[PDB]
RNA sequence: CUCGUAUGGCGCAGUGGUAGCGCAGCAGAUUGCAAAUCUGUUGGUCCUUAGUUCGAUCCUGAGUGCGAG
RNA sequence: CUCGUAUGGCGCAGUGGUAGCGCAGCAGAUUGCAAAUCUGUUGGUCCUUAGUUCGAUCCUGAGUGCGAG
């Protein structure tokens, strides 16, 4: 049927490079799925493939949305189908790239449509929601569906409220319209993952960043700035919108000789993003798609065109012509990487809440972990058995005193 | 959503006592999936499972079709699907259990349908697919879409005519109708394939065989022949339905010290069908199922237990709980079985054809090859270098008589 | 004791110029027959020996093996 | 050759009764914010050392160490 290829991995790897390639070789047009590339301009620190590299190849979802709007998913979700269709229906192949791997989720079905199911909201529903108490919305939602409320924290605010708002919009249990999602992928897709060892990554990356600094970057920086202010915008605005974007925020001190803090501080963020990719990719996107994904290794770069281009142009070429894949999925050395191990073994299957009435964090509440195993872990840590020898000590005293 | 599980493998590695505790432990009913078995009474040499040893569980689309009938691939389609349809409305799971896999496609949407899209069948286009000419029918199919009758070899009639069937009946070309297809697993289903190491099964199934003719087999041989007699039917009669059957055609000689022989024709034939399921299993199931499997080693009997019960019974626990799967999916034993290089590397990819003007078939007809890999096959084997030397030799009489 | 036959794993063809086929084995295919069907292909130097002959798997002798009398 | 002064990977506190705070690091979560957000946690027993005291990282005397006339 309708073929659709999607390219993976961190940043640093040529994701876009690949994502041309393929385009030439197979006739397609790019879609991209970078939740901050979506955003105008600003090029440079949102990382942008420069025009002049894209031998004139077609890009979609990508540099349209105003600084004053709010991306998110089902944004993208009827963009990039959008794309696809129209893509499709004129003989083109889709090549959908990008770093927001959650955002792929799109391609099978793994959302919740609250857009269609239109439903008033009551007074009474909405004080709940729009409420400032703290647990006062999760213990709702273990009112009605615990099933779904078990497998949150009280203090995922962000995710509690949203499974509410659609047991309220849907009226329909959160917890019983996943048991009933089909979560099967859409069109015929094809999962290529760009990857690379972590330290030769980071070296890159880091190098990466200080040219960065360099091409232009803290120009782009201060237009942000100039946007920021002269809007009466607090640092707390950096959890909507382009105001996320990892090489804004991170010098926002400096804007109020320590400019060489926020840099390294960047950095760090980067590598941070870089591994919490990977770790999306092996436990969140895999697992979901079943290992249907074929690996390319991008460590050594003097390489590459042998193991990524070729690698891929071969799968691909086999892809498209609507055949099997004789390729071998995963070269010697990043093997493990699709192994169970490193992949659905770590997903967390054991949702039963535990307190210790003995802990409790700075906001007061106490300390609740989720699954036996994690349960033991906190029993043992060094912050429990602390608490847990005030505390005897404190009862002891009067057992000396009588 | 609504999940299926199918088990697969050769016989003689304890397929349905594993379909039962699975039943019982998931709340589930069978649905048989054999070509076979699928016949009124005839149980001992269709193997069918006793019912003192199916715990009252429920079984589908099993021992219910009239000798006089003749099943088929759509049939089971409509049948199977019911099944599943009804077993899920009751909040049950289905176990699909067979030896046909090539029947388990239905689980997929590989296949097409003739019987909703009527049309009259000219009077011309009848007389060319009825026709008793030899390639007559292909040459046809040849003209109008090659795309697909350069998939088939022109001797291979049953296919061949099928095809054309398609171009009648539906008025598209076979070619296109399957580049559209979707063949995307429908439900959510669970493979487990029971494997045993083919040298400890083989001498297995011989006993089995052996023992067999004494559980009183013979007798449903008999029985059989009392219908195929006084129905003035011929040995070709055994390419349509319960005559196809391993345990009858064999002993047809005998039915005119000579039986001996019968029963070792028997027991090769059992081992030929075992051979081929798993061939299927590795070439045609698996790369369409894109490798979504779970191997369960059964070569040694004695363990089972645990590297069949067991292990299956945690998979499904985990499937069932709708949960990812953090089982191996093969022993280290068995690991190379789910490699490409033992499947979809196998698959044949290419499909231009060859003629030899040197080498012809009893038919008459010249040898066509079908793969450059294989054209060279022939090229070197000693039937077209003996074929090769003798027209040499011949010509070699027209210069000495020139 | 009479007369026969002795060919790749088995069952069989064959010609005076160094051999073919069926089955099994191995392999490819499989979109209404599938426990079925189609397709390709690896194995022999024609029991042993001595002669006849330009030359023998095939002709003659002998030995050995199995075969019916 | 007189002074400060060094405490988990780094940056810094600190009570006589066997230690913290920030960064990082590790880990789990993710179904309209995801380059975000939530959550859980590994790390040194306090420069080396002799004594002072019931007791010591914090009191005292050396030796080590970087810096300081
Ligand atoms: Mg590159
Ligand atoms: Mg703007
Ligand atoms: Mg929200
Ligand atoms: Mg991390
Ligand atoms: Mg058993
Ligand atoms: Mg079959
Ligand atoms: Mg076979
Ligand atoms: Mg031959
Ligand atoms: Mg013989
Ligand atoms: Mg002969
Ligand atoms: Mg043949
Ligand atoms: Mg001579
Ligand atoms: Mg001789
Ligand atoms: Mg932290
Ligand atoms: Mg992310
Ligand atoms: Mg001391
Ligand atoms: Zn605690
Ligand atoms: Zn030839």
Redesign the pocket.
């Known amino acids: 049927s309708k073929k659709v290829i999607v390219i993976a991995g961190t940043?640093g790897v040529g994701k876009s490079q690949l994502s041309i390639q393929l385009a030439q070789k197979f006739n397609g047009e790019v879609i991209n799925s970078?939740?901050?590339?979506v955003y105008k301009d600003i090029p440079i620190?949102?990382?942008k493939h420069p025009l002049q590299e894209r031998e004139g190849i077609p890009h979609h979802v990508m540099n349209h949305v105003d600084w004053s709007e709010?991306?998110?998913?089902?944004?993208?979700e009827t963009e990039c189908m959008n794309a696809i269709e129209d893509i499709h229906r004129r003989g083109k192949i889709p090549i959908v790239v990008g770093?927001?791997?959650?955002?792929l989720?799109t391609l099978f079905?793994?959302?919740?449509?609250?857009?269609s199911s239109e439903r008033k909201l009551t007074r009474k529903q909405l004080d709940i929601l729009e409420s400032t108490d703290p647990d006062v919305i999760y213990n709702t939602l273990v009112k009605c569906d615990p099933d779904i409320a078990t497998?949150?924290?009280p203090?995922?605010?962000?995710?509690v409220?949203?499974?509410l708002?659609?047991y309220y919009?849907t009226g329909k249990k959160?917890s019983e319209?996943?048991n009933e999602?089909k979560?099967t992928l859409k069109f015929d897709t094809l999962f290529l993952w760009l990857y690379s060892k972590?330290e030769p990554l980071f070296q890159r990356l880091d190098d990466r960043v200080d040219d960065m600094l360099e091409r232009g970057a803290l120009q782009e920086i201060k237009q942000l700035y100039e946007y920021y202010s002269q809007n009466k915008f607090t640092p707390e605005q950096?959890?909507?919108?382009v105001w996320?974007?990892?090489?804004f925020?991170e010098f926002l001190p400096w804007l109020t000789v320590k400019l060489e803090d926020c840099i390294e501080?960047m950095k760090?963020?980067t590598?941070?993003?870089a591994?919490?990719?990977v770790?999306?990719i092996k436990?969140?996107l895999i697992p979901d798609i079943k290992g249907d994904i074929y690996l390319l290794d991008a460590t050594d770069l003097s390489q590459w065109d042998t193991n990524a281009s070729q690698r891929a142009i071969a799968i691909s070429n086999d892809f498209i012509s609507n055949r099997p894949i004789k390729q071998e999925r995963a070269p010697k050395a990043l093997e493990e990487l699709l192994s169970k191990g490193e992949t659905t073994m770590?997903?967390?299957?054991d949702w039963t809440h535990y307190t210790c009435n003995v802990?409790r964090?700075a906001?007061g509440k106490n300390?609740?972990?989720?699954?036996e195993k994690?349960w033991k872990?906190?029993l043992?840590?060094?912050?429990?058995?602390?608490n847990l020898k005030r505390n005897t000590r404190q009862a002891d005293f009067e057992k000396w005193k009588i």
């Not at 203090?155 to 995710?159: A, G, H, I, T, V």
């Not at 770590?346 to 299957?349: G, N, R, S, V």
């Not at 043992?380 to 602390?386: A, Q």
């Open positions: 940043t970078d939740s901050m590339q620190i949102t990382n709010e991306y998110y998913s089902h944004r993208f770093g927001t791997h959650y955002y989720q079905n793994k959302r919740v449509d609250t857009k497998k949150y924290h203090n995922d605010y962000r995710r409220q949203r499974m708002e659609i919009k959160p319209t996943f999602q979560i972590p950096c959890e909507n919108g996320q974007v990892i090489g925020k501080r760090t963020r590598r941070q993003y591994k919490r990719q770790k999306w436990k969140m770590k997903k967390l299957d802990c964090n906001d300390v609740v972990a989720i699954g994690y872990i906190h043992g840590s060094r912050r429990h058995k602390s």
